Design a protein around this motif. Structure first.
Motif, PDB file in Angstrom:
ATOM      1  N   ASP A 174      12.364   0.341   3.330  1.00  0.00           N
ATOM      2  CA  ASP A 174      12.138  -0.338   2.061  1.00  0.00           C
ATOM      3  C   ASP A 174      10.803  -1.079   2.155  1.00  0.00           C
ATOM      4  O   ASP A 174       9.862  -0.575   2.767  1.00  0.00           O
ATOM      5  CB  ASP A 174      13.299  -1.274   1.710  1.00  0.00           C
ATOM      6  N   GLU A 175      10.726  -2.268   1.558  1.00  0.00           N
ATOM      7  CA  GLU A 175       9.431  -2.900   1.329  1.00  0.00           C
ATOM      8  C   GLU A 175       8.692  -3.133   2.640  1.00  0.00           C
ATOM      9  O   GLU A 175       7.555  -2.680   2.814  1.00  0.00           O
ATOM     10  CB  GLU A 175       9.637  -4.210   0.568  1.00  0.00           C
ATOM     11  N   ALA A 176       9.340  -3.802   3.596  1.00  0.00           N
ATOM     12  CA  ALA A 176       8.673  -4.103   4.855  1.00  0.00           C
ATOM     13  C   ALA A 176       8.438  -2.848   5.693  1.00  0.00           C
ATOM     14  O   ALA A 176       7.427  -2.753   6.399  1.00  0.00           O
ATOM     15  CB  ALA A 176       9.496  -5.117   5.644  1.00  0.00           C
ATOM     16  N   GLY A 177       9.356  -1.882   5.631  1.00  0.00           N
ATOM     17  CA  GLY A 177       9.211  -0.690   6.448  1.00  0.00           C
ATOM     18  C   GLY A 177       8.035   0.163   6.032  1.00  0.00           C
ATOM     19  O   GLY A 177       7.375   0.772   6.885  1.00  0.00           O
ATOM     20  N   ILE A 178       7.777   0.251   4.718  1.00  0.00           N
ATOM     21  CA  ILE A 178       6.706   1.098   4.206  1.00  0.00           C
ATOM     22  C   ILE A 178       5.362   0.389   4.294  1.00  0.00           C
ATOM     23  O   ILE A 178       4.337   1.021   4.565  1.00  0.00           O
ATOM     24  CB  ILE A 178       6.998   1.526   2.755  1.00  0.00           C
ATOM     25  N   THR A 179       5.333  -0.910   4.030  1.00  0.00           N
ATOM     26  CA  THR A 179       4.071  -1.653   4.039  1.00  0.00           C
ATOM     27  C   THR A 179       3.423  -1.566   5.416  1.00  0.00           C
ATOM     28  O   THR A 179       4.066  -1.803   6.450  1.00  0.00           O
ATOM     29  CB  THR A 179       4.314  -3.109   3.637  1.00  0.00           C
ATOM     30  N   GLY A 180       2.148  -1.232   5.429  1.00  0.00           N
ATOM     31  CA  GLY A 180       1.421  -1.197   6.674  1.00  0.00           C
ATOM     32  C   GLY A 180       0.365  -0.113   6.674  1.00  0.00           C
ATOM     33  O   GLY A 180      -0.140   0.286   5.626  1.00  0.00           O
ATOM     34  N   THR A 181       0.028   0.303   7.888  1.00  0.00           N
ATOM     35  CA  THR A 181      -1.087   1.200   8.148  1.00  0.00           C
ATOM     36  C   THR A 181      -0.511   2.446   8.783  1.00  0.00           C
ATOM     37  O   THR A 181       0.177   2.364   9.804  1.00  0.00           O
ATOM     38  CB  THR A 181      -2.142   0.557   9.052  1.00  0.00           C
ATOM     39  N   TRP A 182      -0.756   3.588   8.153  1.00  0.00           N
ATOM     40  CA  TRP A 182      -0.198   4.858   8.578  1.00  0.00           C
ATOM     41  C   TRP A 182      -1.314   5.851   8.851  1.00  0.00           C
ATOM     42  O   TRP A 182      -2.396   5.758   8.276  1.00  0.00           O
ATOM     43  CB  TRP A 182       0.722   5.439   7.514  1.00  0.00           C
ATOM     44  N   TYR A 183      -1.031   6.813   9.722  1.00  0.00           N
ATOM     45  CA  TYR A 183      -1.973   7.851  10.071  1.00  0.00           C
ATOM     46  C   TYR A 183      -1.286   9.195   9.963  1.00  0.00           C
ATOM     47  O   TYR A 183      -0.145   9.337  10.400  1.00  0.00           O
ATOM     48  CB  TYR A 183      -2.467   7.681  11.469  1.00  0.00           C
ATOM     49  N   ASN A 184      -1.970  10.179   9.407  1.00  0.00           N
ATOM     50  CA  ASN A 184      -1.412  11.521   9.416  1.00  0.00           C
ATOM     51  C   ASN A 184      -2.010  12.334  10.566  1.00  0.00           C
ATOM     52  O   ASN A 184      -2.797  11.841  11.387  1.00  0.00           O
ATOM     53  CB  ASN A 184      -1.580  12.206   8.051  1.00  0.00           C
ATOM     54  N   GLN A 185      -1.577  13.597  10.642  1.00  0.00           N
ATOM     55  CA  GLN A 185      -1.963  14.491  11.729  1.00  0.00           C
ATOM     56  C   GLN A 185      -3.440  14.864  11.680  1.00  0.00           C
ATOM     57  O   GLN A 185      -3.972  15.369  12.673  1.00  0.00           O
ATOM     58  CB  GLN A 185      -1.073  15.733  11.685  1.00  0.00           C
ATOM     59  N   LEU A 186      -4.110  14.602  10.564  1.00  0.00           N
ATOM     60  CA  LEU A 186      -5.526  14.860  10.396  1.00  0.00           C
ATOM     61  C   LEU A 186      -6.378  13.677  10.819  1.00  0.00           C
ATOM     62  O   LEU A 186      -7.612  13.790  10.854  1.00  0.00           O
ATOM     63  CB  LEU A 186      -5.813  15.161   8.934  1.00  0.00           C
ATOM     64  N   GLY A 187      -5.757  12.544  11.123  1.00  0.00           N
ATOM     65  CA  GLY A 187      -6.498  11.345  11.454  1.00  0.00           C
ATOM     66  C   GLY A 187      -6.854  10.476  10.278  1.00  0.00           C
ATOM     67  O   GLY A 187      -7.583   9.486  10.452  1.00  0.00           O
ATOM     68  N   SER A 188      -6.379  10.820   9.090  1.00  0.00           N
ATOM     69  CA  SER A 188      -6.611  10.048   7.891  1.00  0.00           C
ATOM     70  C   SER A 188      -5.799   8.773   7.933  1.00  0.00           C
ATOM     71  O   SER A 188      -4.742   8.700   8.563  1.00  0.00           O
ATOM     72  CB  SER A 188      -6.229  10.858   6.656  1.00  0.00           C
ATOM     73  N   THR A 189      -6.280   7.770   7.205  1.00  0.00           N
ATOM     74  CA  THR A 189      -5.723   6.428   7.266  1.00  0.00           C
ATOM     75  C   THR A 189      -5.171   6.041   5.905  1.00  0.00           C
ATOM     76  O   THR A 189      -5.905   6.025   4.914  1.00  0.00           O
ATOM     77  CB  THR A 189      -6.771   5.402   7.701  1.00  0.00           C
ATOM     78  N   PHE A 190      -3.896   5.690   5.878  1.00  0.00           N
ATOM     79  CA  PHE A 190      -3.140   5.357   4.673  1.00  0.00           C
ATOM     80  C   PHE A 190      -2.697   3.906   4.817  1.00  0.00           C
ATOM     81  O   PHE A 190      -1.821   3.603   5.634  1.00  0.00           O
ATOM     82  CB  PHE A 190      -1.978   6.345   4.598  1.00  0.00           C
ATOM     83  N   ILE A 191      -3.328   2.998   4.068  1.00  0.00           N
ATOM     84  CA  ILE A 191      -2.972   1.576   4.078  1.00  0.00           C
ATOM     85  C   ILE A 191      -2.247   1.275   2.782  1.00  0.00           C
ATOM     86  O   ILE A 191      -2.812   1.451   1.699  1.00  0.00           O
ATOM     87  CB  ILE A 191      -4.191   0.657   4.199  1.00  0.00           C
ATOM     88  N   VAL A 192      -1.019   0.790   2.877  1.00  0.00           N
ATOM     89  CA  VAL A 192      -0.186   0.687   1.696  1.00  0.00           C
ATOM     90  C   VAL A 192       0.608  -0.600   1.711  1.00  0.00           C
ATOM     91  O   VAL A 192       0.993  -1.118   2.766  1.00  0.00           O
ATOM     92  CB  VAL A 192       0.765   1.900   1.574  1.00  0.00           C
ATOM     93  N   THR A 193       0.801  -1.134   0.509  1.00  0.00           N
ATOM     94  CA  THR A 193       1.635  -2.299   0.244  1.00  0.00           C
ATOM     95  C   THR A 193       2.721  -1.863  -0.736  1.00  0.00           C
ATOM     96  O   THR A 193       2.411  -1.365  -1.826  1.00  0.00           O
ATOM     97  CB  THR A 193       0.800  -3.433  -0.355  1.00  0.00           C
ATOM     98  N   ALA A 194       3.985  -2.064  -0.361  1.00  0.00           N
ATOM     99  CA  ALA A 194       5.113  -1.771  -1.233  1.00  0.00           C
ATOM    100  C   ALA A 194       5.617  -3.059  -1.877  1.00  0.00           C
ATOM    101  O   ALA A 194       5.845  -4.060  -1.184  1.00  0.00           O
ATOM    102  CB  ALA A 194       6.244  -1.081  -0.465  1.00  0.00           C
ATOM    103  N   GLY A 195       5.763  -3.037  -3.219  1.00  0.00           N
ATOM    104  CA  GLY A 195       6.325  -4.163  -3.936  1.00  0.00           C
ATOM    105  C   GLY A 195       7.841  -4.087  -4.057  1.00  0.00           C
ATOM    106  O   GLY A 195       8.452  -3.019  -3.901  1.00  0.00           O
ATOM    107  N   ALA A 196       8.454  -5.242  -4.352  1.00  0.00           N
ATOM    108  CA  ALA A 196       9.911  -5.296  -4.451  1.00  0.00           C
ATOM    109  C   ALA A 196      10.413  -4.426  -5.598  1.00  0.00           C
ATOM    110  O   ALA A 196      11.552  -3.941  -5.549  1.00  0.00           O
ATOM    111  CB  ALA A 196      10.384  -6.743  -4.633  1.00  0.00           C
ATOM    112  N   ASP A 197       9.549  -4.185  -6.585  1.00  0.00           N
ATOM    113  CA  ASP A 197       9.830  -3.485  -7.821  1.00  0.00           C
ATOM    114  C   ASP A 197       9.600  -1.978  -7.765  1.00  0.00           C
ATOM    115  O   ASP A 197       9.715  -1.331  -8.806  1.00  0.00           O
ATOM    116  CB  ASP A 197       8.933  -4.050  -8.933  1.00  0.00           C
ATOM    117  N   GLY A 198       9.232  -1.407  -6.606  1.00  0.00           N
ATOM    118  CA  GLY A 198       8.952   0.010  -6.500  1.00  0.00           C
ATOM    119  C   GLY A 198       7.489   0.407  -6.540  1.00  0.00           C
ATOM    120  O   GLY A 198       7.187   1.600  -6.445  1.00  0.00           O
ATOM    121  N   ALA A 199       6.562  -0.538  -6.663  1.00  0.00           N
ATOM    122  CA  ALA A 199       5.160  -0.139  -6.697  1.00  0.00           C
ATOM    123  C   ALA A 199       4.603   0.109  -5.295  1.00  0.00           C
ATOM    124  O   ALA A 199       5.002  -0.526  -4.308  1.00  0.00           O
ATOM    125  CB  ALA A 199       4.326  -1.213  -7.405  1.00  0.00           C
ATOM    126  N   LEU A 200       3.672   1.051  -5.217  1.00  0.00           N
ATOM    127  CA  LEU A 200       2.841   1.266  -4.046  1.00  0.00           C
ATOM    128  C   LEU A 200       1.395   1.056  -4.462  1.00  0.00           C
ATOM    129  O   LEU A 200       0.960   1.578  -5.483  1.00  0.00           O
ATOM    130  CB  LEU A 200       3.004   2.660  -3.470  1.00  0.00           C
TER     131      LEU A 200
END
Ligand SMILES: Cc1ccc(CNCCNC(=O)CCCC[C@@H]2SC[C@@H]3NC(=O)N[C@@H]32)nc1
Ligand SMILES: Cc1ccc(CNCCNC(=O)CCCC[C@@H]2SC[C@@H]3NC(=O)N[C@@H]32)nc1
Ligand SMILES: Cc1ccc(CNCCNC(=O)CCCC[C@@H]2SC[C@@H]3NC(=O)N[C@@H]32)nc1
Ligand SMILES: Cc1ccc(CNCCNC(=O)CCCC[C@@H]2SC[C@@H]3NC(=O)N[C@@H]32)nc1
Ligand SMILES: [Br-]
Ligand SMILES: [Br-]
Ligand SMILES: [Br-]
Ligand SMILES: [Br-]
Ligand SMILES: [Mn+2]
Ligand SMILES: [Mn+2]
Ligand SMILES: [Mn+2]
Ligand SMILES: [Mn+2]
Lengths: 121, 122, 122, 123
Positions: A1-27
């Motif tokens: 949920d919110e805390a689990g998704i929020t953060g810094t992610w990397y895919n297999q290509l080395g790309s960087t996905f920085i995301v904040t999840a809101g309590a209401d469903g927003a990314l």
């Protein structure tokens, strides 16, 4: 949920996905691609299911990047659709579609499909 | 194309896509599906190319809907990827991916793919 | 069904799909694309459900073309997956995946997706 | 060129078994046994591959179809795989796939699943 998704992610290509999840469903956040017609960070926005099922299944989500920022315009957008899977080693598993602007004659070749898996390392 | 994209769109299933294109490249609005495990309107957000090429090429865009609202939760999300084509009959042509939450054993069957075309014609 | 699928079909691009459906599920024939890096006819092969439901549903099928013949090699292949829908105006409704050969570093951009609808006209 | 490399027995990450013969001029023939889904035993497959690939390190394009009817079951559906065979120390086939099942026209919008399979010769 919110805390689990929020953060810094990397895919297999080395790309960087920085995301904040809101309590209401927003990314919201930024995306940095290691490949393609891309330089530096791009705005992203999306949605996630903020009350997932209670049977251990993943959390559905999706987001969009339009590949325009201050440094480059690739006249294209990518959307990612997938699920977040919590656990000791969390993962976001996605499929994506990348559409670039074409004339109508060339619309048939306007969309790439692929799959990205994101982890926290 | 802020003026072009902004408005009320309908696809070939009769679904209603109400959208505002903002200055920054943002899409905000609501989606009401005529089909599926869905009822009434759902929040959508997305992005579009705010400085498209002027050589007859369409305008790339995309948006997401998570299928949870005040009435139903279908534990799924759809993203549409496509382009806006201006002209006497403005059109948004998309392909979409619908993912629903699965166990890891069933994740191989978690994603549907399809295509929607939208116009402003009610 | 056999005689339903067998024949000459055209898609919205003007491409020509000449197919023979065998009694036990085989598709064989040739494909002529109106677009892309293609010239003349290419061998196709596929499979279809030779005992479909009789409840109003379509008949599932698919086929592959490798874009190599004696005129040209485009180092690519397309697969179509869809269903045959019978009746007064028969249709084959498909989505497709086109993969072209890449290096491993460029494999992420190797596959296009689209949709083709085939009928008996054009 | 890849005739002998593609020919053989392959497994994907679901445990499905892909047994294929590559002909000298681009044909693929064999059987597919899915570990998952409404499927039992082997199903016939046919496909095509690029029999004369490019030189500068590119993979070899290919695709194949299975209709999910055999002597045991009929799932009224078909899958196509589209991908590349890559050589090297450990040969791999990387694919994306589309599974269509028969629907009414009212439900045609939900007729097609998409996914991805990677095959190797181990296991
Ligand atoms: C003939 C022809 C004409 C035009 C194009 C456009 N060609 C796409 C250009 N647009 C980009 O290159 C934007 C960056 C996308 C990066 C992807 S997004 C999905 C995946 N996942 C990541 O992390 N990076 C990648 N082609 C062929
Ligand atoms: C075996 C199995 C298990 C679970 C499901 C869930 N099944 C999807 C559930 N989630 C919805 O039904 C939400 C509404 C989606 C409407 C779509 S979005 C794309 C298209 N375009 C439109 O306008 N409406 C449609 N299935 C099969
Ligand atoms: C940036 C970049 C680099 C390399 C390539 C190669 N790209 C290979 C193209 N390979 C062909 O052009 C063969 C013909 C396919 C025709 C399609 S098949 C699906 C659709 N339906 C039809 O009837 N025709 C069309 N690209 C972009
Ligand atoms: C709501 C709804 C209604 C109807 C269906 C039918 N559903 C089609 C079932 N048809 C099969 O189950 C055949 C086996 C497919 C195996 C796949 S093929 C691609 C992947 N890769 C593998 O090795 N196995 C898997 N659904 C959902
Ligand atoms: Br490009
Ligand atoms: Br459903
Ligand atoms: Br090309
Ligand atoms: Br099923
Ligand atoms: Mn191409
Ligand atoms: Mn299914
Ligand atoms: Mn490209
Ligand atoms: Mn469904």
């Amino acid at each position: 949920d919110e805390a689990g998704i929020t953060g810094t992610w990397y895919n297999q290509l080395g790309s960087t996905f920085i995301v904040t999840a809101g309590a209401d469903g927003a990314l919201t956040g930024t995306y940095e691609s290691a490949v393609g017609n891309a330089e530096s960070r791009y705005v992203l926005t999306g949605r996630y299911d903020s009350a997932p099922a209670t049977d251990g299944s993943g959390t559905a989500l999706g987001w969009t990047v339009a590949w325009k920022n201050n440094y480059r315009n690739a006249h294209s957008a990518t959307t990612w659709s997938g699920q977040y899977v919590g656990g000791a080693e969390a993962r976001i598993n996605t499929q994506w579609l990348l559409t670039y602007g074409t004339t109508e004659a060339n619309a048939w070749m306007s969309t790439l499909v692929g799959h990205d898996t994101f982890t926290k390392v």
